Design a protein around this ligand. Structure first.
Ligand SMILES: [U]
Ligand SMILES: [U]
Ligand SMILES: [U]
Ligand SMILES: [U]
Ligand SMILES: [U]
Ligand SMILES: [U]
Ligand SMILES: [U]
Ligand SMILES: [U]
Length: 517
């Protein structure tokens, strides 16, 4: 943390953050969500990290160079250490990225190494070459060298993500699945795990071996797993929570902006809220059904009337303000809602649905007051605009993500937040073989458009290709875009260091500080 001259620090430097739900895991290779990544940034540090404004900056790597955007060499700081005092080396990264690539690990982020195009990843994922063939090597204890199969100019931007953080081989090997328990875990970020009580709290304590420990200010941070946004706000306003999670309650938000304006932080965020359609399951493998659902949803009602928190109606998967995004708005988005509804009803009548044999299916969402309120509105809108019946179903976060990976679903509430600010952080997730492809969407045409983006060495051609990839997605109605998020949360006046300037919201508690109050 960089505490401003003249600010007074509180005697006690402790922080309580709500984190939305119980994490899937603390293992960097078994996670894919925001709540998971919130805790991972405090415990595990990769080659680069985001600075307080979100720019990719030195992490374990203090400096790096690239040869033709294909061979990247990272010079690791001599004093990077794990929490047991042993050195963080380039061999740690070698073992780590191989473990990420290995199909036996089953990471939901195995494909992150495809997105960066590390050499031999496709074969490794396919079981054809062992994970040891991956294009990574330690040229020495403090030098990590990555070889890609094509030039990727934005490659380093990917490296702040938890899936490319190191994991400690000895704890992993020795304790297997229990390596992340507090008595076993070893970490290299600014914090260490102190306590982990499932469905109660996660408590982290400063890691004194962290290389930048002298600038760390908060000695302890607790992450809570509260999925009720109302409860989160209540415990924030009672004094227990210093920073809510960034899901705000429909019940209280308008009142909060009028009551504690200075505390309600609202900033740009690179995430899209949509309904994920299970593209491989009838009748959702029919484009007319997906197009109907997409068109009959009234974004104006949902965004402006039912939510009303500053979100923007969405017509694409990649947020239009992502760096490099130059998207074309489909004509349906400028049509009337009435005109959307007729087209929709027309398509469903064409797909064979009547009044007598209507379309009925499940709407799966992760336990939350906000998602429940939004699914109820969407269910009534779909019912009135299109005659479809939906059965709402909630599942705890971890179970919800697993259900979507398994494909044991019809439609699900969904939200993707960028991992790096470039259109492929979204688009690569709809690739046929992506491990992040929970829409279970498979389009040869869509895959070819994205593969083409690294064949050209031009950014204009590249943006035009991302634009057409978004048009292929929309044409197929792979999803139902609903709105582009804003990052809205409550933060106490004594919490310093949070700018709200990072559109990825990659917060590190090592950057925060408690002002005396
Ligand atoms: U004190
Ligand atoms: U650049
Ligand atoms: U940029
Ligand atoms: U269903
Ligand atoms: U509620
Ligand atoms: U470039
Ligand atoms: U106080
Ligand atoms: U106090």
């Amino acid at each position: 943390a960089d505490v401003p001259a003249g600010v007074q620090l509180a005697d006690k430097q402790t922080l309580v953050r709500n984190n939305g739900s119980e994490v899937q895991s603390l293992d960097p290779h078994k996670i894919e969500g925001v709540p998971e990544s919130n805790v991972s940034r405090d415990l595990f540090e990769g080659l680069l990290i985001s600075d307080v404004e979100g720019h990719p900056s030195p992490g374990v790597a203090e400096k790096w160079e690239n040869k033709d955007f294909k061979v990247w060499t990272f010079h690791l700081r001599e004093n990077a250490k794990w929490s047991d005092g042993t050195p963080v080396t380039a061999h740690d990264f070698v073992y780590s990225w191989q473990r990420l690539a290995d199909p036996n690990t089953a990471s939901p982020y195995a494909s992150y190494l495809q997105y960066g195009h590390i050499a031999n990843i496709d074969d490794i994922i396919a079981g054809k070459k062992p994970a040891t063939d991956l294009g990574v090597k330690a040229l020495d204890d403090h030098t990590f060298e990555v070889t890609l199969s094509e030039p990727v100019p934005y490659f380093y931007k990917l490296l702040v993500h938890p899936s490319v953080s190191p994991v400690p081989k000895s704890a992993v090997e020795k304790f297997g699945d229990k390596w992340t328990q507090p008595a076993n875990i070893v970490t290299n970020g600014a914090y260490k795990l102190k306590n982990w009580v499932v469905n109660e709290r996660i408590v982290l304590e400063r890691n004194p071996q962290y290389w930048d420990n002298a600038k760390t200010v908060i000695n302890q941070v607790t992450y809570l797993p509260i999925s009720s946004e109302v409860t989160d706000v209540n415990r924030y306003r009672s004094g227990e929570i210093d920073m809510t999670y960034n899901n705000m309650p429909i019940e209280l938000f308008q009142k909060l902006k009028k009551e504690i304006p200075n505390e309600v932080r609202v900033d740009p965020y690179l995430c899209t809220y949509y309904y994920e359609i299970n593209n491989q399951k009838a009748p959702f493998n029919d484009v007319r059904v997906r197009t109907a659902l997409k068109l009959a949803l009234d974004r104006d009602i949902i965004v402006n009337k039912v939510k009303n928190q500053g979100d923007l109606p969405a017509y694409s998967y990649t947020p239009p303000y992502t760096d490099g995004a130059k998207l074309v708005e489909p004509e349906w988005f400028k049509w009337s809602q009435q005109k959307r509804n007729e087209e929709a009803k027309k398509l469903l009548a064409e797909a064979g649905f009547t009044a007598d044999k209507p379309l009925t299916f499940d709407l799966l969402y992760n336990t939350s007051d906000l998602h429940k309120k939004l699914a109820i509105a969407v269910a009534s809108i779909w019912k009135k605009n299109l005659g479809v019946n939906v059965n709402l179903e909630n599942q705890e976060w971890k179970t919800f993500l697993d259900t979507r990976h398994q494909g044991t679903f019809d439609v699900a509430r969904a939200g993707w937040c960028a991992d790096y600010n470039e259109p492929t952080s979204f688009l690569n997730t709809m690739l046929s073989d992506s491990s992040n492809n929970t829409a279970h969407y498979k389009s040869p045409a869509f895959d070819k458009l994205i593969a083409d983006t690294l064949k050209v060495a031009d950014d204009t051609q590249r943006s035009e290709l991302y634009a057409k990839a978004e048009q292929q997605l929309d044409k197929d109605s792979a999803i139902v875009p609903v709105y582009y998020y804003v990052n809205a949360r409550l933060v106490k006046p004594w919490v310093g260091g949070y700018t709200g300037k990072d559109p990825l919201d990659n917060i590190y508690v090592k950057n925060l500080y408690i002002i005396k109050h």
